[PDB]
C-alpha cells in the first residue's frame, strides 16, 4: 500500500491527516513564538522557538508571528519549522516514504508555488507532490460537480465558479477581507467600549471573542436600532484573568464588514455583490445552475446568520425567477481538507503527481505547467 | 494336366455330381478344388468363378470342361507355423481362442466346423499341440 499525506496551508490553521481519512488527524494554528523576555532561571529548558499548539500555552511570554499573510508565505524558515513540526511531531511520519498534497489560493504570487515545491523536494524529499485550489476541493467535499465556491479563511476570500468540472478562470474574484482583518477591526471597535488589546498573544484573546460572540445581523439597521433600544443584545465574556467584559451591538458589527467593506475602508464590494458580479461574468447558459449550487467554505463563513444574510441579500441582486439556493454544511471549515482527502485517494489522481525524477529533470518551473 | 490326371479328375467330379446331369454347382466348385488338393479361400473361389450371383451360384450347373480352367488357374510351412504361433511359446494353442477366432474373424466358420477339424486333437486343458495338429491338417 501507500497513503498520501494531505496538508492545507491556511493562513491561520494548519490541517493535516492521511488521505482516505474523513477528518484531519492534526489541527494547530500556524503560529510561531519566540521568547520575549530575559531568561532568568538557569536550568530552565530554553527552546529557541515554539510552534503551533505549544505557542498557545506560553503566549504570555512570547511574540507570536504568523508566517502566512493573505495567503502569501512571508518568511520561509518559520514555514519550514511549521511543516517540520507537522510531519515529525503531529503526524509522526517520515515524508520521504509518503507523497504529499498541498493547497493554495487561486491568484497568489507565482513564486510561491516554485518555492513551496523546492522546499518539499530539497528539504523533505517527498516522493511526489501536488497543489490544489481550495475552491476546487470544496466541491469534492460537498459532493457536487457544478458550483460557485465562496471560500474565506484567515487570510483570503475568493470566488471560483465551476461547471461540470470546467473551472472558468476569468470568472474568478479575490478579496483580502478575512478572519484576521475582522479581528483587527474588532480591536478598534472594542476600544469604543473602553477595552484595549495591543499585543499579539492578546490578539488571540480577541479572536476567541470573535469566535464565541459574533453573529450576522439579518437586518443591520433594524438590529442596530433594537440594540440602541435595549440591553437585550448585550452579552458577557471573560478574559483569561477573570475580568468579565460585556459586549453589545458591536459584536455583530464585525460580521457586517464582510457585507460592507467600506467600514474597514476597502475599495471593493462585499462578498455577496462580488459573488453576483462573478456569476454575471459567466456564460448565461450556466448561470441557472450556479444560482442553485452556492457552496460556502472556510471558517470565516461560520458565523450564524451569514447563510440567511447571503441568501436574502443576493436575492436582491438576482432576477426574481431564478431561485437562489445556498448550501452551508456544518463542517465546511474542514471541507477543503475533506475534499483533498477525497481527491488524493482517486486512482485517476495517481498519474497526476509531480514525481521526484520529473522535478529533477524540469526544475520547479514544472509546477506551473503540470500542476495547475 | 495330362490325360490320366484329367480322367482321375473327371471321375472325382462325377462322384460329386449330386443331381445326375454330369455337372456340379458353382457353389460346389470350391469343394471340388479342395478335394483335388487345392486350398483356395471362398473369396478366391468366387473370384475364379467370376463373382457369380447368388442365383447362378446355387442353381447354374457346369460340366467338368468349364470347371477345369478355374481349377487350373487356382493350381497355378513356416508362414503357416508362425500364423498358428500368433495365437500361442510352449508349442500349444488354446482351443477356446482358436474357436473364437475361426468363428469371429476372417471368413467366419460355424462352431461345428471348428469342432470337426479340432475333434480329438485338443487335450483336457483345451490346448492344441500346433506342430502335430498342423502336420495333421496339412497331410
Amino acid at each position: 500500500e501507500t497513503t498520501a499525506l494531505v496538508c492545507d496551508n491556511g493562513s491561520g490553521l494548519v490541517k493535516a491527516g492521511f488521505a482516505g481519512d474523513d477528518a484531519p488527524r492534526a489541527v494547530f494554528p500556524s503560529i510561531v513564538g519566540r521568547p520575549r523576555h530575559q531568561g532568568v532561571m538557569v536550568g530552565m529548558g530554553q527552546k529557541d522557538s515554539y510552534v503551533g499548539d505549544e505557542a498557545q500555552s506560553k503566549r504570555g511570554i512570547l511574540t507570536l508571528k504568523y508566517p502566512i499573510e493573505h495567503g502569501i508565505i512571508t518568511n520561509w524558515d518559520d514555514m519550514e519549522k511549521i511543516w517540520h513540526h507537522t510531519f515529525y511531531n503531529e503526524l509522526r511520519v517520515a515524508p520521504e516514504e509518503h507523497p504529499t498534497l498541498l493547497t493554495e489560493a487561486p491568484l497568489n504570487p507565482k513564486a510561491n508555488r516554485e518555492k513551496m515545491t523546492q522546499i518539499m523536494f530539497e528539504t523533505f524529499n517527498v516522493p511526489a507532490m501536488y497543489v490544489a485550489i481550495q475552491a476546487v476541493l470544496s466541491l469534492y467535499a460537498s459532493g457536487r460537480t457544478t458550483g460557485i465556491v465562496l471560500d474565506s479563511g484567515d487570510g483570503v476570500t475568493h470566488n471560483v465558479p465551476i461547471y461540470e468540472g470546467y473551472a472558468l478562470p476569468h470568472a474568478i474574484m479575490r478579496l483580502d477581507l478575512a478572519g484576521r482583518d475582522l479581528t483587527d477591526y474588532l480591536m478598534k471597535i472594542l476600544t469604543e467600549r473602553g477595552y484595549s488589546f495591543v499585543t499579539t498573544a492578546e490578539r488571540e484573546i480577541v479572536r476567541d471573542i470573535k469566535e464565541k460572540l459574533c453573529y450576522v445581523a439579518l437586518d443591520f439597521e433594524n438590529e442596530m436600532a433594537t440594540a440602541a433600544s435595549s440591553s437585550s443584545l448585550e452579552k458577557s465574556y471573560e478574559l483569561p484573568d477573570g475580568q468579565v467584559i460585556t459586549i453589545g451591538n458591536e459584536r455583530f458589527r464585525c460580521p457586517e464588514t464582510l457585507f460592507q467593506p467600506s467600514f474597514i475602508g476597502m475599495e471593493s464590494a462585499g462578498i455577496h455583490e462580488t459573488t453576483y458580479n462573478s456569476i454575471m461574468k459567466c456564460d448565461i447558459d450556466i448561470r441557472k445552475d450556479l444560482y442553485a449550487n452556492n457552496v460556502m467554505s472556510g471558517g470565516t463563513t461560520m458565523y450564524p446568520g451569514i447563510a440567511d444574510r447571503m441568501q436574502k441579500e443576493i436575492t436582491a441582486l438576482a432576477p426574481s425567477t431564478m431561485k437562489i439556493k445556498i448550501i452551508a454544511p456544518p463542517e465546511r471549515k474542514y471541507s477543503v481538507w475533506i475534499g483533498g482527502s477525497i481527491l488524493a485517494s482517486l486512482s485517476t489522481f495517481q498519474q497526476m503527481w509531480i514525481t521526484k525524477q520529473e522535478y529533477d529533470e524540469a526544475g520547479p518551473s514544472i509546477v506551473h505547467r503540470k500542476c495547475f | 494336366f495330362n490325360k490320366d490326371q484329367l480322367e482321375e479328375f473327371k471321375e472325382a467330379f462325377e462322384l460329386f455330381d449330386r443331381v445326375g446331369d454330369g455337372k456340379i454347382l458353382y457353389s460346389q466348385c470350391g469343394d471340388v478344388m479342395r478335394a483335388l488338393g487345392q486350398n483356395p479361400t471362398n473369396a478366391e473361389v468366387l473370384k475364379v468363378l467370376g463373382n457369380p450371383k447368388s442365383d447362378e451360384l446355387k442353381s447354374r450347373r457346369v460340366d467338368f470342361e468349364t470347371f477345369l480352367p478355374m481349377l487350373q488357374a487356382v493350381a497355378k510351412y513356416e508362414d503357416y507355423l508362425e500364423g498358428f504361433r500368433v495365437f500361442d511359446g510352449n508349442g500349444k494353442v488354446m482351443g477356446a481362442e482358436l474357436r473364437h477366432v475361426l468363428t469371429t474373424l476372417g471368413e467366419k466358420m460355424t462352431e461345428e466346423e471348428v469342432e470337426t477339424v479340432l475333434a480329438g486333437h485338443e487335450d483336457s486343458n483345451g490346448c492344441i499341440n500346433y506342430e502335430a495338429f498342423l502336420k495333421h491338417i496339412l497331410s
Binding site: 460537480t145 456544518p330 | 469343394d31 479361400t41 477366432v101 475361426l102 474373424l105 476372417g106 466358420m109
Partner: protein, 743 residues
C-alpha cells in the same frame, strides 16, 4: 495425410455439434464428399479424423489416439448413454456427468475394493481421487486439497458428500459424517439462492477440513466459507430470489412463535419482493425449515439461539421496508411516524428515536470536536442497505462459527485433507456484478489449475528423463491484471463510488477512455455505451454497467452499528459484532480480499480435481445434450487441457503392456525375450521418425496418431493369419466331410 474410402470423419452440425461420416473417395490434394446421404463437404483454409472403436470405449481421454472436441464428446456420450458409467479421467482431472439417478456403485464392497490401489489399476470413480489424496498424504506430510467445480446443477455437494463417506468408511471408527451431513441443511438454507437458470444455487465458497491423527484416523472436521455474495441480500434480478432462509421464514409466519416477529406475507417485504417469484414449484418452503431447525438442534445450536437467528432475520426484513421522505434537496427524514421501524426497534430493543435519528444523519468528528451532517435521501438508502448487508454477513459468520464448535476436537490434528465446493465459470445472457466476481474468481482458480498441471507434467518428464522444451500452457495473468490491477475495471468502479457524482454511464465512459484500445481483452459492444466485453479464458462475455454502483457500495455508519451493539434485549445481536476501516470498504474490495485468502488457503496444499457437467437443462434422467456439454467442457478448461496435451505427446504406454498387446506383430526370431529392448528393437520398422515417438525408462510416449496406426496394422496381420488358417482348415474339412460321408 490419411483419408480413405470407409474411413470416418466428424462434420459440424447445428443440432449436434459433431456428427460422423464415412469417406466416399480417397483424399488427394479439392472438395471432399462423405456418407452418413451425400453432400460435398466444403473445405477452407481440414476435417477431424475419428478414432477406431477399440479406443473410444476406454476409460481415459488421453487413451484416445485423436484428441479433439468431437472425439472427446462422443466418448463421454457413449460412456454415459450406452455403458451407464459417469466417471471418466482427463489428464489428471476427473470428470463427472450428472446421472440424476442413483446407482449401486457406492456400496461398501466397492469402497473396500478401491482401498489401497491407484489411478490406473481401477476404473475411474470419485472414490479413486479420495484414495489418491489418502495415499499422497501418507507419501508426504503435505496437506491435500480436493476441488469440485461446475455449474450449479452439476452435483458438487453430492460429490463432496461421497468423498467424505469414503474417507470416514476407510478411516475406521474414532463420528464425523453424521454432524457434517447434518450441517448441510443449515448451510444450504443460509447460503443458497434461486436464480434464473436453476432453483438451488450456492452463492458462497465452501470448504471442509478433515483432520487426521498422527496415525491416520479421522479426528474431526472444520469448516470455512469464502466469497459470500453479500449483494443478494438487498438487490435481486428478475425472476431471482434471495437466500432461501428468508422465504422459509416468511412461509413459517403462521407458526406460533413467529407471530411475535409480525412477519407479513412472502412478497410483502422489499427484499423478498424484488424477484417477483415468491414460490418454487415442488419445494414447500414452509416445510423445509422443519428440516433446517431439526439440523440446528441435531448440531446443538440452542433452542434459544434459533429464535435469536430468526429474530435477526426478521429484523433485516423489517428494516428493508423503511422509507425516507425528502425534507429538502439537501436532506431527508423518516416521516412523522414510519410503522415498520417500530417493529424493527421492538424486535431488537432499541429506542425508536435513536434509530430514527442515526438513520437520517451521520456523525463526523475530529477528536477536539464533533459535527453532524444531514445526508441525502440516496445516501441514507445506501446506508440502510449496507447495514442490512453487514448484519447478514456477520450473522452468517456466527452461524458458521457455532457450526464449527460442534465439529472440532481438541486433539492436535496431524494433517488435514480439504474438500472444496465452488461455483464454476458461468455465462448468462444478462450479466451483472455477481457474475463479474464469479468469473474473476474462476480466473484465479484456473490460473492455479494451469500452473499445477504444468508443474506435474514437468515432474513427469523429468521422472522419465526426456527433454522438456515443448511443455506449454495458457497464461491468463494478462486477463486477471485487467480486472485486478490499478486502473483496472474494479479499481475504477471503486474510484467512481468516491467521485462526487458517479453513475453507470460515467463509469463505462471511463472504462472506454482508459482500456478501450490499450488491451485486446477489453472490447466495447458495437451498439451500446452501457455495456462492455471481457475475453475470459472460456469465452468473450459481456456485462451491463447498469446497477454496478448500487451493488458496489457498502459503508456502514459507526453510529447505527453502535446503536445495535448497545442493545440488551437478547444475547445474540451484541454477540455478532464483538470481534473500523473495513466498514469503508466496498463489496468489490472485500471480495478481492476474500479471494486472496482463498488462494492462500489452497496454495500450500496440493490439489486434486473433479469437474461436474450438467447434462441437460430439463432434469431429464440419465440423458444428455451435446450442446450444453460442450459449453460446460469449454468453461472447465477441459478442452484447453486436451488440445494442449494433443499438441505434444498425449499417449503413455508401458513396455509390458505394449508387448502384451502387440506380440501378435512379433516374430519369435525377433523376440529378444525382454520386453523393453524387444520393442525398442521392433518399433523402428513400423513408424518413420523418432520425432513422432519416444522412449523412456518405463514408458513409450507416442504422438497422437500412432496408436490407431498400430491398431490397424495389428488388425491386418490378425486377418491375414486367420484367413490362412481358415482357408487350409476349410480345404481339408471339405475333403473330410464329403469324402468320409460318401465313403
Amino acid at each position: 495425410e490419411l483419408y480413405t474410402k470407409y474411413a470416418r470423419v466428424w462434420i459440424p452440425d447445428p443440432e449436434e455439434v459433431w456428427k460422423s461420416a464415412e469417406l466416399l473417395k480417397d483424399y488427394k490434394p479439392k472438395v471432399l464428399q462423405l456418407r452418413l446421404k451425400d453432400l460435398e463437404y466444403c473445405l477452407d483454409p481440414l476435417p477431424p479424423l475419428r478414432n477406431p472403436d477399440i479406443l473410444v470405449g476406454e476409460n481415459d481421454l488421453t487413451a484416445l489416439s485423436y484428441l479433439h472436441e468431437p472425439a472427446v464428446l462422443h466418448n463421454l456420450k457413449v460412456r454415459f448413454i450406452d455403458s451407464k458409467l459417469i466417471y471418466t479421467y482427463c489428464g489428471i482431472v476427473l470428470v463427472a456427468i450428472n446421472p440424476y439417478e442413483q446407482l449401486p456403485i457406492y456400496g461398501e464392497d466397492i469402497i473396500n475394493a478401491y482401498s489401497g490401489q491407484n489411478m490406473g489399476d481401477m476404473d475411474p470413480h470419485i472414490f479413486a481421487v479420495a484414495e489418491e489424496a489418502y495415499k499422497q498424504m501418507a507419501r508426504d506430510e503435505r496437506n491435500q486439497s480436493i476441488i469440485v467445480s461446475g455449474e450449479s446443477g452439476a452435483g458438487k455437494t453430492v460429490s463432496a458428500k461421497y468423498a467424505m463417506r469414503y474417507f470416514a468408511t476407510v478411516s475406521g471408527s474414532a463420528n464425523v459424517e453424521e454432524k457434517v451431513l447434518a450441517s448441510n441443511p443449515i448451510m444450504e438454507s443460509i447460503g443458497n439462492a434461486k436464480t434464473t437458470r436453476n432453483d438451488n444455487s450456492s452463492r458462497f465458497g465452501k470448504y471442509i477440513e478433515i483432520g487426521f491423527d498422527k496415525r491416520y484416523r479421522i479426528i474431526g472436521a472444520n469448516m470455512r466459507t469464502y466469497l459470500l455474495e453479500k449483494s443478494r441480500v438487498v438487490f435481486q434480478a428478475e425472476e431471482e430470489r434471495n437466500y432461501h432462509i428468508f422465504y422459509q421464514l416468511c412461509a413459517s409466519a403462521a407458526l406460533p412463535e413467529f407471530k411475535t416477529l409480525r412477519l407479513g406475507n412472502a412478497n410483502y417485504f422489499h427484499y423478498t419482493k424484488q424477484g417477483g417469484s415468491p414460490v418454487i414449484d415442488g419445494i414447500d418452503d414452509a416445510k423445509e425449515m422443519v428440516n433446517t431447525r431439526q439440523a440446528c438442534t441435531l448440531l446443538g445450536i440452542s433452542d434459544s439461539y434459533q429464535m435469536g437467528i430468526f429474530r435477526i432475520l426478521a429484523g433485516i426484513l423489517h428494516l428493508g421496508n423503511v422509507e425516507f421522505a425528502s425534507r429538502d434537496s439537501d436532506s431527508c427524514a423518516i416521516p412523522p411516524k414510519h410503522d415498520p421501524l417500530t417493529i424493527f426497534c421492538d424486535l431488537m430493543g432499541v429506542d425508536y428515536e435513536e434509530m430514527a435519528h442515526w438513520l437520517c444523519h451521520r456523525k463526523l468528528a475530529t477528536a477536539t470536536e464533533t459535527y453532524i451532517k444531514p445526508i441525502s435521501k440516496l445516501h441514507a438508502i445506501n446506508a440502510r442497505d449496507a447495514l442490512a448487508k453487514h448484519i447478514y454477513a456477520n450473522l452468517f459468520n456466527w452461524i458458521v462459527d457455532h457450526v464449527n464448535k460442534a465439529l472440532h476436537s481438541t486433539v492436535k490434528q496431524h494433517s488435514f485433507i480439504g474438500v472444496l465446493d465452488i461455483y464454476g465459470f458461468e455465462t448468462f445472457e444478462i450479466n451483472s456484478f455477481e457474475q463479474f466476481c464469479i468469473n474473476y474468481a474462476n480466473e484465479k482458480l484456473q490460473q492455479q489449475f494451469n500452473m499445477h498441471v504444468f508443474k506435474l507434467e514437468q515432474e513427469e518428464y523429468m521422472k522419465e528423463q526426456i527433454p522438456w522444451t515443448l511443455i506449454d500452457f495458457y497464461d491468463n495473468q494478462p486477463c486477471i491484471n485487467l480486472i485486478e490491477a490499478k486502473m483496472g475495471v474494479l479499481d475504477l468502479l471503486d474510484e467512481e463510488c468516491k467521485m462526487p457524482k458517479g453513475s453507470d454511464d460515467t463509469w463505462a465512459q471511463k472504462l472506454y477512455n482508459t482500456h478501450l484500445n490499450k488491451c485486446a481483452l477489453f472490447e466495447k459492444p458495437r451498439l451500446s455505451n452501457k455495456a462492455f466485453i471481457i475475453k475470459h479464458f472460456a469465452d468473450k462475455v459481456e456485462y451491463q454497467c447498469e446497477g454496478f454502483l448500487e451493488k458496489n457500495k457498502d459503508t456502514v455508519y459507526e453510529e447505527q452499528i453502535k446503536v445495535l451493539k448497545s442493545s440488551k434485549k437478547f444475547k445474540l445481536l451484541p454477540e455478532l459484532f464483538q470481534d473500523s476501516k473495513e466498514h469503508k470498504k466496498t463489496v468489490g474490495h472485500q471480495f478481492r480480499n476474500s479471494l486472496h485468502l482463498l488462494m492462500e488457503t489452497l496454495n500450500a496444499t496440493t490439489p486434486h480435481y473433479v469437474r461436474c457437467i450438467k447434462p441437460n437443462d430439463f432434469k431429464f434422467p440419465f440423458t444428455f445434450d451435446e450442446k450444453r456439454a460442450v459449453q460446460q467442457l469449454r468453461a472447465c478448461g477441459v478442452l484447453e487441457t486436451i488440445r494442449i496435451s494433443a499438441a505434444g505427446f498425449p499417449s503413455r504406454w508401458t513396455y509390458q503392456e505394449f508387448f502384451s498387446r502387440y506380440r501378435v506383430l512379433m516374430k519369435q526370431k525377433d523376440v529378444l525375450s525382454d520386453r523393453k529392448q524387444t520393442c525398442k528393437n521392433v518399433l523402428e520398422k513400423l513408424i518413420l521418425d523418432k520425432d513422432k515417438y519416444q522412449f523412456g525408462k518405463t514408458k513409450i510416449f507416442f504422438r497422437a496418431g500412432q496408436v490407431a496406426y498400430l491398431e490397424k496394422i495389428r488388425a491386418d496381420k490378425l486377418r491375414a493369419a486367420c484367413i490362412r488358417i481358415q482357408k487350409t482348415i476349410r480345404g481339408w474339412l471339405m475333403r473330410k466331410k464329403y469324402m468320409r460321408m460318401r465313403r
